[PDB]
Each structure stands twice: as structure tokens, then as C-alpha cells.
From TrEMBL:
Gene label: LcaE7
EC number from the UniProt entry: 3.1.1.-
Any Pfam family matching the protein: COesterase
Occurrences of domain Carboxylesterase type B (ranges): 30-543
Name of protein: Carboxylic ester hydrolase
Lineage of origin: Eukaryota, Metazoa, Ecdysozoa, Arthropoda, Hexapoda
SUPFAM superfamilies per the UniProt record, alphabetical: alpha/beta-Hydrolases
Family named by the database record: Belongs to the type-B carboxylesterase/lipase family.
Length: 566
């Protein structure tokens, strides 16, 4: 990231700290939890609203020392009152702006926000799980401020969970108790805390909605898939992701040795010896070297992250993913709660910055063989069958005789988001009680209000609605500002928080009380539908057939001779 954007960011960080101070009030409050009393504080917003804030509520023991890489442990209760008037640190990660490692192993906290601690009615509880490819992210209000949602009468909860190798190391040897998915197990424990404590904050424990974007959507989907969470919540929203996205899981059991060897491990590839070395390493050393773990071959085959959610090699008490996600869909309790899913109208624009530094990626579209789903592709991607499958992809996205950068990013929209969504819907339809699933398409484009991901994707002055552009209209961030009440951005904020709050409340995202939705008839998807309908969210709200449908069917056609793997 440029020095200009670095200094720009440092300043906004300095501005955030002062604005945070200025929007703090002297009205502190104490709430009960099952682990003890917590002290919160009332905060203000730039729109002259206010909310009660509890940050730094632990839901697990700090996963340090002998607990590194292990499933989370219930936290120790306290006598007296715990200070929750400040946030804790984020999980150890590379700061995308600075390039330096930041955060802490001591990161298993959540934050609780509401405009009223003693509401007349038990309120809907909305639980946000952040994305960041399971390797970055936080619940800090500089990125995920509740300032917009607290205009609504709900309780909003933002969780953290372990990232990177510290969250997702996985070792085959059963004796070592490192099966993988520690970070997902973190989420499970936070959800359990939420179920048992939201009532203390005005929440209705019988009306909880879990939602997340990108890896947070994959996370939400995992929480709907695993038996560990059966009946814990009542609606789910998957924003630009789910568990069967190719980036959402990986078999990484062999990569722990590689990481160790990157960090100076001397010895043999043995799970016990590799673990012992990894247990003593500085956590910042491991996280910084994570970028080097994937092989050239793995990158070529579109493995995006070395460590992430995995199929656990053996079962344990807290096991979250005993089988591949496709399999877990067959029996998933979450198939039977109201569900909303969606994507932006140009997801793949997110990969602009990556394409810039690696222009040759565009030549992958010559045959598109590298984008053929890995389960269908041969190892070298040289089989004539793989060339045939790649030709189907090529026909779907290459518009001229030579592929362009926009063809690449259009392709990415489907490989990473739209096609996995299609597969999920079709799979789920064969295993559901009949609860509704609604689709949205976020198609609102502005650069008058942005979020820091625009900086990371190098999308300043860039047109189209990228992966993460919707976050701007759900959460306050330190790059935001007060918008005029009549502006299209402000209207979109009210629309997005409105629909999300309507869906969380009733399991149905339609309400006549939301501006622009007067002529909207938002029906869910049925198994018999050959064409998906979605609410296209733009300056106007309009129900349309998913424009991406034709391309989606073209991807599906690669599976013509392998229907059992679709
Ligand atoms: B969603 O959580 C997500 C989807 C796809 C990608 C590539 C992704 O990467 C985020 C990231 C990239 C580079 C460095 C740090 C984070 C996230």
C-alpha cells in the first residue's frame, strides 16, 4: 500500500481515536452475564443518535500457551464488575495497510450494542461475523461500527474469532488434539454465549439472526451446517459467500510442516515435533510467514489461503466439520430456518489490485483450465476433458478473441461467488423442510461514502459494485462521514438496515415500511424454478431475474458427465 494511503490511514486513525473520545459519554451502565457483571458506556453517532456499548466481553479463555491451536475453553467467571468500556485487540494478522503484523493472541471477545437496555419488548438479536478470508478482520468500531443498526430497535453483536494459522492449523495425529477449525469453534462458543446472555441486554433468545459477509458468510453457513449449533438461532444471512465456495475450505494438514520450516524448524516431518516448535514460536513470526506457505502449484490451482476451515481428520467433543460441507448440507439443521443470500453486481472487481501486480493472470483465460472446479480438473490441467470444461468457462466470460482484465474479473464473480451459491441452493433443495430462501443482488454504486476495503482493492475512482462495497451501508467505519438525510447513500443505509432488521424480526425481508419497496413482490426461490428471482438493490428496488443466470448454467454444464459431484 502506498505511502500516501499509509499516511492517509494513520491520520484517519488519529481522527478515529479523537472522534471516539468525543462520542463517548459519562453514562456508564452495568449488565449481568452468566460469568459476572460487565460495565458498558453510552456512545453517540454522527447522526446524533446514541447506543449502549459493551466491548471486550470474553466468551472463552485467552487461547495462549498450551491453548494455542486448541479448541476454545469456557472463560473464568469473576466477582465484581468487569470493565467493558473499551475494545480488546484483534486476532493476530497482517495489517493490509501497513504491511506489519498487528493484533494479539488474546482476541476472543465480542461486543454488544443497543439503543435501549430496558426495551418494552424482547428484541431481535443480530450477530455479525466479519470476513477477511479467515486471515484478517476485527470487531473494532473503526471498521464495523453499529451506528447505523442502532437506529433500529434491535440488539447487535459483533464477534471476533481466531484467524490464520493460529485459528486453523490442523494436524492428523489424534494424540495432539489439533484437529483444525479452532476459529470456527471460537464462533460456536460465542454463539452459545449469545444464546445464554442476550436477554440481559434486551435481546430475545428465541429470535437470533446470524449474518456475515465473505468469510463471515462462509462462517455463518458453517454455523448453520454444524450440529454443534443446532437450534441456537433462527435466521441466517449469507452475504457474498457460503461454505462451498472454493476459497472457504482447504485440506491443510500437510502445510503445518511447511510453516514450521519457514520459521526455522530443524528436524523431521512429524506432527508432534512440528506442533512443539509451532507452540513456542512468536505468533507474529508465524502469521507473517503465512503468505509464503502455499506452493506455486497450489496457487495455480486457485488455493487462496494456506490455512482455513478444514474437514477434521478425526472426531472430538468440539468437532465442527466432520465431513465436507457438501455432505454436511444433507443433514444440516440450518437448512430449516429462514435464509437470505446475495451477492454484489460486480463481485470480481475486488481482484483489481491483484491483477495489477500479476497481469499475466489474464492469460489464464486463454483456455480457462485453471478455473475449472478442482474436483473435476486433472492435476496438470492438461487432460482433454479439462480443456473441454475450460472451454465452457471461456465461452461464458471471454467476449473478444483475446481475454481482457474485465473478462477475468467477471469470471471471478462466478468462480468465487455466484456458482458456489447455485450449487448450494440446488443441494439444499434436496434436504429441506421447506423454509424459504430469499435472494438479493446489491447493485448500488457510489464513491461519496466508502469503506477501507476500497483502499485494499485499489478501487478509488473505479466503477461497479465490488465484493464488500455493501458493508458501507451497514456499518460505520473511520472513512465514513455524516451524509445528508436526502442523499441516495443515506437512503441506501436506511434500506439495507431496514431490510436486514425486517428479515431478522420476521424471517421475511419484505416490508411496506421500507422506501422504494412499494411495488416489490419478493418471493423466495423454489426447487422448481429454472430461473432465480432476486431483489436488485439499486437507486430503485426492483425484482428481476438474476442477470448472472445464463453464466451460472454454463458453469453447471461442466458437470454434465459428473452429476454426482455437482
Ligand atoms: B472474504 O472474506 C474474501 C474473499 C476473497 C478474497 C480474495 C479475500 O481476501 C481478503 C484478503 C486478501 C489479501 C490480504 C488479506 C486479506 C477475502
Amino acid at each position: 500500500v502506498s505511502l500516501m494511503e499509509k499516511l492517509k490511514w494513520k491520520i484517519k486513525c488519529i481522527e478515529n481515536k479523537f472522534l471516539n473520545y468525543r462520542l463517548t459519554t459519562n453514562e456508564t451502565v452495568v449488565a449481568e452475564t452468566e460469568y459476572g457483571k460487565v460495565k458498558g458506556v453510552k456512545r453517540l453517532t454522527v447522526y446524533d443518535d446514541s447506543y449502549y456499548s459493551f466491548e471486550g466481553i470474553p466468551y472463552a479463555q485467552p487461547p495462549v500457551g498450551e491453548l494455542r491451536f486448541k479448541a476454545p475453553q469456557r472463560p473464568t467467571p469473576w466477582a465484581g464488575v468487569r470493565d467493558c468500556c473499551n475494545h480488546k485487540d484483534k486476532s493476530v494478522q497482517v495489517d493490509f495497510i501497513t504491511g506489519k503484523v498487528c493484533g494479539s493472541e488474546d482476541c476472543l471477545y465480542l461486543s454488544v450494542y443497543t439503543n435501549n437496555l430496558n426495551p418494552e419488548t424482547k428484541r431481535p438479536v443480530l450477530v455479525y461475523i466479519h470476513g477477511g478470508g479467515f486471515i484478517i478482520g476485527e470487531n473494532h468500531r473503526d471498521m464495523y461500527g453499529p451506528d447505523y443498526f442502532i437506529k433500529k430497535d434491535v440488539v447487535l453483536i459483533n464477534i471476533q474469532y481466531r484467524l490464520g494459522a493460529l485459528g486453523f492449523l490442523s494436524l492428523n495425529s489424534e494424540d495432539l488434539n489439533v484437529p483444525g477449525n479452532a476459529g470456527l469453534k471460537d464462533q460456536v462458543m460465542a454463539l452459545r454465549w449469545i444464546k445464554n446472555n442476550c436477554a440481559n441486554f434486551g435481546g430475545n433468545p428465541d429470535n437470533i439472526t446470524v449474518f456475515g459477509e465473505s468469510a463471515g458468510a462462509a462462517s455463518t453457513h458453517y454455523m448453520m451446517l454444524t450440529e454443534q449449533t443446532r437450534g441456537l438461532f433462527h435466521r441466517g444471512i449469507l452475504m457474498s459467500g457460503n461454505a462451498i465456495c472454493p476459497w472457504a475450505n482447504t485440506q491443510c494438514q500437510h502445510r503445518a510442516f511447511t510453516l514450521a520450516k519457514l520459521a526455522g524448524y530443524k528436524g523431521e516431518d512429524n506432527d508432534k515435533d512440528v506442533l512443539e516448535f509451532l507452540m513456542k514460536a512468536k505468533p507474529q513470526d508465524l502469521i507473517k510467514l503465512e503468505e509464503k506457505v502455499l506452493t506455486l502449484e497450489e496457487r495455480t490451482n486457485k488455493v487462496m489461503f494456506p490455512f482455513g476451515p478444514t474437514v477434521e481428520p478425526y472426531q472430538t467433543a468440539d468437532c465442527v466439520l466432520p465431513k465436507h460441507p457438501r455432505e454436511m448440507v444433507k443433514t444440516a439443521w440450518g437448512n430449516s430456518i429462514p435464509t437470505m443470500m446475495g451477492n454484489t453486481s460486480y463481485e470480481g472487481l475486488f481482484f483489481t489490485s491483484i491483477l495489477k501486480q500479476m497481469p499475466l493472470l489474464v492469460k489464464e483465460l486463454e483456455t480457462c483450465v485453471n478455473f475449472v472446479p478442482s474436483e473435476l480438473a486433472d492435476a496438470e490441467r492438461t487432460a482433454p476433458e479439462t480443456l473441454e470444461m475450460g472451454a465452457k468457462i471461456k465461452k461464458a466470460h471471454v467476449t473478444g478473441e483475446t481475454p481482457t482484465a474485465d473478462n477475468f474479473m467477471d469470471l471471478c464473480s462466478h468462480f468465487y461467488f455466484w456458482f458456489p451459491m447455485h450449487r448450494l441452493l440446488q443441494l439444499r433443495f434436496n434436504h429441506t423442510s421447506g423454509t424459504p430462501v430469499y435472494l438479493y443482488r446489491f447493485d448500488f454504486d457510489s464513491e461519496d461514502l466508502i469503506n477501507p476495503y476500497r483502499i485494499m482493492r485499489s478501487g478509488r475512482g473505479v466503477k461497479g459494485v465490488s465484493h464488500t462495497d455493501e458493508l458501507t451501508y451497514f456499518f460505520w467505519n473511520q472513512l465514513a462521514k455524516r451524509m445528508p438525510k436526502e442523499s441516495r447513500e443515506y437512503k441506501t443505509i436506511e434500506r439495507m438496515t431496514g431490510i436486514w432488521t425486517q428479515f431478522a424480526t420476521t424471517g421475511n425481508p419484505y416490508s411496506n415500511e421500507i422506501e422504494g419497496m412499494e411495488n416489490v413482490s419478493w418471493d423466495p426461490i423454489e426447487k422448481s424454478d429454472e430461473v432465480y428471482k432476486c431483489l436488485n438493490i439499486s437507486d430503485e428496488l426492483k425484482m428481476i431475474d438474476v442477470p448472472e443466470m445464463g453464466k451460472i448454467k454454463q458453469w453447471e454444464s461442466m458437470f454434465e458427465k459428473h452429476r454426482d459431484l455437482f
